[PDB]
Amino acid sequence: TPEEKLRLQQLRELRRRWLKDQELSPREPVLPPQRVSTYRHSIFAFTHVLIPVWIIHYYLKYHVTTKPYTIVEKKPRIFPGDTILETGEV
């Protein structure tokens, strides 16, 4: 169809005209504005882990014997390496 001649070719100079207005980056258009103001980097891992490791254990050493039955750790599973003979090997 021919009829779209006078139309939407205005849009080509209208849409692409808005989009023309759109793109801007001089003068740092984030002002920002105001204001002021790796080896070590050895305490960042320390402020990370070494603060808790202290705090968490201070809640344990002072603790495990406080609770009547706290952490339940299991038996040694003794093997005939202490008081025993084998005696086989059979």
* Binding residues for another protein (CB under 8 A): 1-12, 14-16, 18-21, 23-24, 26-27, 29-31, 33
**Given the complex with another protein, which of 12 and 61 has the nearer CB atom?**
12
CA 81 to chain centre: 48
**Given the complex with another protein, which of 27 and 77 has the nearer CB atom?**
27
Residue 15 Cβ vs another protein, minimum distance, rounded to whole Å: 6
Residue pair 82/88 in contact (Cβ under 8 Å)? The answer is: no
**Given the complex with another protein, which of 13 and 82 has the nearer CB atom?**
13
Residue 52 Cβ vs another protein, minimum distance, rounded to whole Å: 21
Residue 42 Cβ vs another protein, minimum distance, rounded to whole Å: 24
Return the closest-CA partner of residue 64 out of 51, 55, 73.
Answer: 73
Reduced to 3 states (helix: H, G, I; strand: E, B; else coil), residue 49 is helix
| CA separation for the pair 71, 64 (Å, rounded) | 7
